[PDB]
Design a protein around this ligand. Sequence first.
Ligand SMILES: [Zn+2]
Length: 139
Amino acid sequence: GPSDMYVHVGNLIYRNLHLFNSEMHESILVSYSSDLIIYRTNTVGDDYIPSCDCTQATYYCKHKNRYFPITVTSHDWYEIQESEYYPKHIQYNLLIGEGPCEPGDCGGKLLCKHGVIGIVTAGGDNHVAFIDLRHFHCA
Ligand SMILES: [Zn+2]
């Protein structure tokens, strides 16, 4: 659903590594540099990760409990200021754009007209960053 804070495609669940990492040894894929973890699940999800290059997007902002349109820009990597879960660091495979973000917002879905392309991973001042999931799926 629109409010689910993760992506569920077939039997794969995509989530923020910093909010998983507990059963990390049971996961199927981990990208430490991208705050991403993927694992097998027993139910089938209906999300779909496309392989487009869209920048016209929309995302779920948990603390506002609503969706916001957003224009995102790709970044192979980018500096990310310290937080409550990650200290100052460079993160990779990002999508950034302007919009609200507060602690607890990670996992929120970012979608383009084709499907889900990311999940919230970080928030700065007036900007929000997402993991570009298109980079972890075969076309
Ligand atoms: Zn698209």
